[PDB]
Symmetry: D2
């Protein structure tokens, strides 16, 4: 079958890969709409996963079940489904410990464009269909549905890990797609003041739309000083790290109140060392908790998020700035993701 893959480091191209076969509990899905991700860029142009040879890219997609294994009972061919980027192996000790995203290994829940071929192919494999798929509502716009697969689940996970309280002040560093969802999630957790950090005009408007009460731009001051000024030297209760370099951790620690929580959902892949400012971290006694983790996946997660969209708890349309029709547009969309033009948040390719 045809599939857009990473030929080699810094080399992209369409290839003729084999068609995946479904195991007894698996499903073969044909993509209806997909979306390129920053991670795809990191994998190819930054060798985040080493020299992957001819591995199909993509992990964000909604599609149609084409084939189903003999044991799949809840999903059958023809079923339109939302595919969470994280598809864990539900039968593992990690799952029993309550950490699905790490079933059988650290970050093992993330299989697409890692352990196996991604969604940028005529067909892709989904392990344990009954446990990793969710039905796509008949009237849900494809572009929006694709946003659930990673953007929504990740951003919301940032807000969840942040353990936000009713009225908590929150700072979201990085207002890209994930950051915007972090803002949306923060608001949906009862956050009061939400300060989004970014400069891209399109992202700024989206940030405000999702709940940002204040917008800070690096271009006019050290972010911590700006936050401090806005909070009258008090600082903020929570900080969600969604974008930026490793230095953001230091900034997060510096702007969060002692006893606050810093939630990281930014997949760092460049500087090999995130640093905690000793003095600002109260020498490790300021009670400034630091959390960070891969977005939850699986059927339940997808269904719960889906239901939130169905009940209009969040409008994912604002994340989609570019929509292409026709499989061939994947390359252009991915390159767009690499070049990062000023008016881009997310791009969806509807087949």
């Amino acid at each position: 079958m045809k599939g857009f893959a990473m030929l080699g480091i810094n080399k992209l191209g369409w290839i003729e890969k084999e068609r995946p076969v479904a195991g007894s509990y698996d499903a073969i899905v044909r993509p209806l709409a997909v979306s390129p991700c920053t991670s795809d860029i990191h994998t190819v142009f930054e060798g985040a996963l080493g020299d992957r040879k001819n591995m199909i890219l993509g992990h964000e997609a909604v599609g149609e079940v084409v084939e189903v294994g003999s044991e799949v009972k809840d999903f059958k061919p023809g079923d339109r489904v939302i595919v969470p980027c994280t598809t864990p192996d539900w039968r593992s000790l990690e799952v029993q410990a309550g950490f699905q995203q790490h079933s059988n290994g650290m970050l093992a829940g993330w299989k697409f464009s890692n352990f196996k071929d991604g969604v940028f192919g005529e067909y892709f494999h989904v392990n344990d269909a009954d446990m990793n798929l969710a039905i796509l509502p008949k009237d849900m716009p494809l572009e929006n549905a694709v946003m659930i697969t990673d953007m929504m689940t990740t951003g919301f996970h940032g807000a969840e890990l942040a353990d936000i309280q009713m009225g908590s002040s929150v700072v979201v560093i990085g207002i890209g797609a994930v950051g915007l969802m972090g803002i949306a999630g923060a608001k949906l957790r009862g956050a009061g003041r939400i300060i989004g950090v970014g400069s891209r005009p399109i992202c700024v408007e989206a940030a405000k739309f999702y709940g940002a009460t204040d917008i800070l731009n690096y271009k006019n001051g050290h972010i911590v000083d700006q936050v401090m000024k806005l909070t009258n030297g008090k600082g903020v209760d929570r900080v969600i790290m969604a974008g930026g370099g490793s230095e953001t951790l230091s900034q997060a620690v510096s702007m969060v109140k002692p006893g606050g929580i810093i939630s990281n959902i930014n997949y760092h892949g460049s500087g090999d060392a995130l640093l905690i400012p000793r003095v600002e971290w109260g020498c490790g006694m300021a009670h400034k908790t630091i959390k960070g983790g891969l977005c939850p996946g699986g059927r339940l997660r997808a269904e719960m998020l889906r239901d939130m969209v169905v009940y209009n708890r969040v409008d994912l349309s604002k994340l989609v700035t570019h929509v292409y029709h026709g499989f061939d547009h994947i390359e252009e969309a991915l390159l767009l993701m690499k070049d990062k033009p000023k008016d881009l948040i997310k791009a969806v390719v509807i087949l």
Copy 2:
């Protein structure tokens, strides 16, 4: 001073009570706007607190600081403040244990119309001003501010105790003021589906406004069966008990999924026994947690909720259906609260 008080059981009337004096850490506040509560009715007409003799009623009010003790540093006379219904004694072992609402006794945080004269007087006493008051924003409508004092804090507390997850299905039993805030709080915690239970037209519209995706009326089926039908026999993740008789507990347990949480914010005062249906509760092994508690009070709580109002996280105006001007209207407003006419949610008396 003049004050509307409970003369005796089932007897209401204005009296000439003494003017409260402020201790070193206390403040004497003059009400700007007050609101009658269902609890006031329960106290007077249902002897919920026994035969209280000439005790001034009310615990929902925003006012102006008239007098301040020598040790009060953050509040001075002239200051317009939001007074939380719960004003705990912050120096107690219960506070150290993390339960302010019970500082120095069960429900000891609730002093107005219980341990001391309420807010339905020319002046009222606030213990530990610096720890129990919050500045009322210059442009915040009085009617709305009063809703923060109890309705908002209680309803939101129900959603908080419910430990709602992103996408959780929630059933709110009782769509009166508190229930409406429970719905609003639920939505602000990321709830997906929110089923409100009630029939009063005005409350139903308010419920939908605050986030209710479905509305159920007792008049056409056993609530549990209706919930079951709506959820395809799956049940709901959370249940917030905001209104109704003791039987609602049984209904809550029956409709919540095993492992779910039932949050009670309904002050029961009639049937002296809430029953848990053994079979439905999985014989006490279904992991159906039951929580219940007085609304948090104090300065921080009031400020956090206030900030949420300032940041338009919730529109409290929909709770206020009746607004009177002039202290004398307290009686009429309280009686209105007793008669419960079809178009009443909350009534605010602006002095």
Copy 3:
């Protein structure tokens, strides 16, 4: 094969049932040592599960893997294993929600002597061997190992649900096997004062051994008054309901401090209504949380508990008062469980 089963309500007897076959992920185990349980009695003599026809009893056993399905990779025939009483279907939405004990239904984790034949047979079926079995340490006494299967996991679960703090005062109502483990678990959670409620001499000594600092007997006062007297009217932080009638709930609520937690691990099966004393529960505003749930099962749980035994964190030997050798003794052991002689805690039948 031969198996001791419930012929009908109040009728016990050995029968010739068919031998269970192992599915691809299942295992057929031959019991090495088993233990009768109070639940077995409730099922037979109290029809707790209705009129079960010829269903083999028992759910507490350690054995040897005889047969293994083609997909079982971690367990092979000859392996000596600890079988948790709770063997969940790890591939379910409830598991994804974090509630294994209810995978595919309320209390669905408990299959033995419920959904299928128990362990009181020449062989018994274990679903998903790799996910529901644990290796029995070579030198671990069989009698002790059997205590892990239910007694330890349940009692400890009570302490876990109780969310005990370092120094918390805990009252354990019912000092039978489960209660004794509740006491042991409470101590292992850092509880300070532990008050055990019971009178049976043998259980009293065991209670003290496991950590009980005080022992209360109903025979000389209303338990709440006794607890109050001991705590100087202050009450206790936590209460674990391990035994007694439905009235214990009321007692638990009455003796626990507002903001405390009541953990129920007592499978109620008689009075069809547990009552919460309104006034003592602070009318549902005292922050007295009530939890209750089936013991966790599965491999991880069994392994973790096992490791605690291996590291001498708890001595399970004190639970075993009667040890029989020979399969035929199951009847006598079960009857002993029904008659409840003064010197009985738990009885183990080593085949």
Copy 4:
């Protein structure tokens, strides 16, 4: 009055400071037994708190109430009390937020040898006696009681922050007094395997006594590799950082399982940057939570810990290796703390 103070950086000596006066809610206490701390050394010889001029040292002591303010109701002169090292200002927004250790500032709960003169004086000041003191049991050995003030509360706090589960594997880095308490606390939280890291013979024996199942020495391998080998490449669930340089953070992250928790109770004061190994931290997506915080103080904390000692939940005697009689011995004891002889854990000076 006489008091052992920090004359200047690296300069220790007895001085004639003024006697503290008690405010309305305060108490003046005379030390009965005190204990030098590593922090005292860091303050003096490492300028951890800058150039403190003539500030009396010490924050670990049990004493007798000499003077009591007019508002102190629970404590009167003659009362023997345990003084927690952390004495928060219970009337603050931080307390309302649930973080007493930071009342009115980061680490503001720690007043002795920071915001005011320490306990190494003829008399010392205790703010809010009723909220910050605990009665010393008549028969509790002074040396042991002093260990409660900081060592016990800190070590246990490490175990508490670690959110240990029944059977969790825990690694405690640094087996000094705090680390030993971390081990004891870990065991008291139901930890299964406890690996203590250290080499000092006296500390090693104490570690085993408190619950350490394994002891690792840096002298024979990279600690992570050793831990990995012991756990069969699986790693550990929790890691408590009690001692060592900033590099221990990296080691903790490297040895903890993804989804595990790292609890820091080591007051870092040397290298001004604790580093998180990007790759080992799963690039900030491994769910490896990092917590760290000052020991809880106040009356409730002290009483709960005290009760644990009373109920023999922990034997603090093993922490005390040196006991001196006579106030003058403070200097020798503090110097001993600086020189760190092989046979020293903690030293207590009984006046």
